[PDB]
Design a protein around this ligand. Structure first.
Ligand SMILES: Nc1nc2c(ncn2[C@@H]2O[C@H](COP(=O)(O)OP(=O)(O)O)[C@@H](O)[C@H]2O)c(=O)[nH]1
Length: 177
């Protein structure tokens, strides 16, 4: 009935924004604070009411020895990259997956490609082109989810809210089973 969820990924990919959208979607409405550490949110998925305890690693991306103190007893990981940052996707296999598999051995991972609203954004394409890069394609996220053994792959926009509810439903199912 209580499941611990930890959200990880590079700085500025939208970890906190995703927690905010989910927490503002709760009913009855509650004031959503600025930080998420053992933050209790109730969700109903399929039959069951579940308490999700949310932990955000934003602000700790460069504190390699302090960040893993939040990992014990985790039930599901949300591992996030940004579709507007191929660098953040490359850190999925190179940084986040080895870390999560060491500290959370058999814990399900949901791979989340956030900022999907920027895939066709003209400003984003122009800025990425300066570095000889382009937005992440959906096939690339799906392939990465298979490579790292993720339970599932989902694309979201915290800005438009599309896909956010579905990410948390999938994470709850994975935590339950
Ligand atoms: N266009 C767009 N911007 C986003 C999205 N999610 C977050 N952002 C923005 O990206 C920036 C970083 O978001 P934040 O939640 O603080 O990332 P965190 O460091 O991973 O916790 C903020 O300026 C947000 O407005 C999204 O889905 N689309």
């Amino acid at each position: 009935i209580r499941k611990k969820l930890v959200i990880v990924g590079d700085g500025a990919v939208g970890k906190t924004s995703l927690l905010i959208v989910f927490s503002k979607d709760q009913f009855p409405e509650v004031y959503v604070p600025t930080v998420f550490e053992n933050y209790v949110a109730d969700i109903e998925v399929d039959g069951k009411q579940v308490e999700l305890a949310l932990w955000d690693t934003a602000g700790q991306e460069d504190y390699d020895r302090l960040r893993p103190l939040s990992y014990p007893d985790t039930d599901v990981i949300l591992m996030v990259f940004s579709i507007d940052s191929p660098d953040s996707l490359e850190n999925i296999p190179e940084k986040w997956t080895p870390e999560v598999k060491h500290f959370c051995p058999n814990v399900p991972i949901i791979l989340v490609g956030n900022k999907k609203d920027l895939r066709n954004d003209e400003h984003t394409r122009r800025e990425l082109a300066k570095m000889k890069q382009e937005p992440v394609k959906p096939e690339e996220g799906r392939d990465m989810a298979n490579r790292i053994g993720a339970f599932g792959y989902m694309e979201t926009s915290a800005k438009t809210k599309d896909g956010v509810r579905e990410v948390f439903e999938m994470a709850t199912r994975a935590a339950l089973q």
